[PDB]
């Protein structure tokens, strides 16, 4: 059939396009209602409560020694850094391609983020570029399991242990993913998860989880999330603040909702993994289309699908890849495929990291007089990946999205059947 962009029928009819996420069932509604009526609405509520219940269930499902429920994935990262003694005068190596929270977490704990370039295929921090950027000030590495792909934990943990650095996994985008059969989050000193409403195991709003095998680390995060106070069910409180703490408490209602979601997680995983595999198998046949992949000895959570497009496949060798990216985005959106970008620039190009003002007076950079790259200066692979890639977000997460992803594949095949029109749009 003809391209929608030139008057043909869209591959994805409008009545098929909408996807509900989070997927709210009666079990979720009842969990929320029971949390309201339970009269234990806060983390610090004495006795059994939905927050401690989620901590136990998450730890149990993923085999973690300790789980500390917190306000956000960002708070999980910053509290992990605080617990591991990272702070003023320390550097933390993070990927140049991530959600900004990965770069901000070090700043939040008054440490300096140092950006390492990513791998052109995995989109994860390249251990080859991590080694280059270690200094006398480096205290920690935050590998991100970006888009749901576990990072090269062999080489990241090897680098950290060779240099005496801490490892905090940013596993926000990769719940249930494994590296050498180990649940992500449990491989580093600590692991951070986001339960934000867009995530693979969402809450009805905001939420975070910190996991660790280290009891002392867990206890530090437990104090840190509640103004530095010890709060233990049954134990007598002393209302002492033992050190720097915040209000990073998770909501009981959100905890109860995620507990309900977690009971169905692997049923949804089964559907997602089948649906995405079938979708990527069709796109993998299209020349100049690189489907995302799990690295060796890993599984992919498929939180975000990022595709790279080769101009050479459309005879556009020499033309800015961004021209092809824009042409494909326009044609696929006309078919009803909600192709997006995820990050328009590497994190080091963000004003917060370029300006190095931070809290004011250049802190945390001012502690050591540490500098960073100017905008556009470094991280060519992160730039190359952004230049030629489009993403699919949300729609593939729903267990009933099988037929929708086949309609998306119909759209991709239609566009690829009209390479002359792709080339024309790209060249205009």
Catalytic residues: 199
- Should residue 178 be labelled a site residue for ligand KKX when binding is judged by CB under 6 A? no
Which residues, numbered 285-344, are part of the site for ligand KKX (CB under 6 A)? 340
| Half-sphere exposure at residue 334, Cβ-oriented, CA atoms within 13 angstroms | 17
Question: Residue 194 annotated as binding?
Answer: yes
Q: Which stretch binds a copy of itself (CB under 8 A): 244-252, 294-302, 326-334, 380-388?
A: 244-252
The distance of closest approach from Cβ of residue 392 to ligand KKX in the complex, given in angstroms and rounded to an integer, is: 10
**Axis crossing angle, helix 321-335 with helix 402-416, rounded to the nearest 10:** 130
- The verdict on 254 binding a copy of itself (CB under 8 A) reads yes
DSSP string, 334-396: HHT---B-S-SS-GGGSHHHHH--TTBTTBTGGGTT---PPTTSS-HHHHHHHHHEEEEESGG
Q: Taking CB under 6 A as the rule, does residue 73 contact ligand KKX?
A: yes
Number of residues binding to ligand KKX, judged by CB under 6 A = 22
206 counts as binding a copy of itself under rule CB under 8 A: yes
Task: Return the one option of a copy of itself, ligand KKX, none that residue 359 interacts with (CB less than 5 to 8 A, by type).
Answer: a copy of itself
Q: Where are the beta strands (DSSP E) in 96-246?
A: 112-116, 138-141, 166-170, 178-179, 182-183, 190-194, 208-212
Best CA proximity match to 247, nearest among 72, 36, 87, 83? 72
Region from 12-20, 47-55, 98-106, 214-222 binding ligand KKX, contact rule CB under 6 A: 98-106
Minimum distance between the CB of residue 424 and a copy of itself, rounded to whole angstroms? 25
Taking CB under 6 A as the rule, which mask of x and - marks residues 182-211 in contact with ligand KKX? ------------x-x-x-------x-x---
Alpha helices in 39-152 (DSSP H): 50-62, 73-83, 100-108, 127-133
The neighbour count for residue 334, using CB atoms within 10 Å, is: 19
Cβ(159)–Cβ(131) below 8 Å: yes
In DSSP terms, which residues pair with 247 in a beta bridge? 226
Q: Which is nearer to ligand KKX, 205 or 287 (CB)?
A: 205
Residue 209's nearest CA partner among 168, 180, 178, 179 is 168
The CB-of-347 to a copy of itself minimum distance in angstroms stands at: 9
Which one, 240 or 428, has the nearer CB to ligand KKX? 240
Nearer to a copy of itself, 83 or 381 (CB): 83
Sign of CA dihedral 316, 322, 323, 327: positive
Q: Which is nearer to ligand KKX, 76 or 134 (CB)?
A: 76
Residues 342-401 that bind a copy of itself (CB under 8 A): 342-345, 350-352, 355, 357-361, 363, 366-367
CA–CA separation, 240 vs 194, rounded Å? Answer: 29
Distance CA 171, CA 24 (A): 23
The count of other CB atoms within 10 Å of the CB of residue 273 is: 16
Rank residues 124 and 288 by Cβ distance to ligand KKX and give the closer one.
Answer: 124
Binding residue numbers for pyridoxal 5'-phosphate: 73-74, 173, 194, 247
Binding site for ligand KKX (CB under 6 A): 44, 72-74, 98-99, 101-102, 144, 170, 172-173, 194, 196, 198, 206, 208, 237, 247, 340, 393-394
Q: Which residues are annotated as a binding site?
A: 73-74, 173, 194, 247
């Amino acid at each position: 059939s003809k391209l929608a962009a030139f008057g043909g029928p869209p591959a994805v009819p409008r009545d098929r396009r909408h996807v509900e996420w989070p997927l709210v069932e009666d079990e979720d509604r009842k969990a929320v209602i029971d949390a309201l009526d339970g009269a234990r609405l806060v983390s610090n509520s004495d006795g059994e409560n939905p927050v401690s219940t989620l901590e136990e269930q998450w730890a149990g499902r993923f085999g973690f020694g300790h789980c500390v429920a917190v306000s956000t994935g960002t708070a999980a990262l910053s509290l992990a850094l605080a617990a591991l003694g990272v702070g003023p005068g320390d550097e933390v190596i993070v990927p140049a391609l991530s959600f900004i929270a990965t770069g901000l977490a070090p700043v939040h704990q008054m440490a300096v983020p140092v950006f390492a370039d990513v791998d052109p295929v995995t989109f994860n921090l390249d251990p080859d570029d991590v080694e280059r950027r270690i200094t006398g000030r480096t205290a920690a590495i935050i590998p991100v399991h970006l888009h749901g792909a576990p990072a090269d934990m062999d080489r990241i943990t090897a680098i950290a242990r060779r240099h005496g650095l801490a490892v905090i996994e940013d596993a926000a985008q990769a719940p249930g993913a494994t590296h050498r059969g180990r649940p992500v989050g449990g491989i580093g000193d600590a692991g951070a998860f986001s339960l934000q409403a867009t995530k693979n195991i969402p809450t009805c709003g905001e939420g975070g989880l910190l996991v660790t095998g280290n009891a002392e680390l867990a206890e530090s995060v437990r104090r840190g999330r509640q103004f530095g106070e010890v709060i233990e069910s049954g134990r007598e409180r002393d209302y002492v603040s033992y050190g720097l703490g915040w209000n990073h408490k998770m909501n009981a209602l959100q905890a109860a909702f995620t507990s309900a979601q977690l009971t169905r997680f692997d049923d949804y995983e089964s559907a997602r993994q089948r649906n995405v595999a079938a979708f990527l198998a069709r796109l993998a046949e299209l020349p100049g289309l690189r489907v995302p992949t799990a690295a060796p000895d890993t599984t992919h959570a498929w939180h975000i699908l990022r595709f790279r497009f080769d101009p050479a496949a459309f005879g556009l060798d020499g033309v800015r890849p961004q021209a092809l990216r824009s042409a494909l985005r326009r044609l696929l959106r006309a078919e009803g495929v909600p192709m997006s970008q995820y990050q328009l620039m590497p994190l080091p190009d963000q004003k917060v990291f370029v300006d190095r003002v931070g809290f004011g007076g250049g802190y945390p950079w001012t502690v050591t007089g540490a500098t960073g790259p100017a905008a556009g200066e470094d991280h060519p692979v992160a730039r190359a990946v952004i230049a030629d890639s489009l993403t699919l977000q949300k729609r593939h997460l729903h267990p009933e999205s099988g037929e929708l992803l086949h309609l998306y594949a119909d759209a991709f095949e239609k566009v690829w059947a009209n390479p002359d029109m792709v080339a024309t749009l790209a060249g205009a």
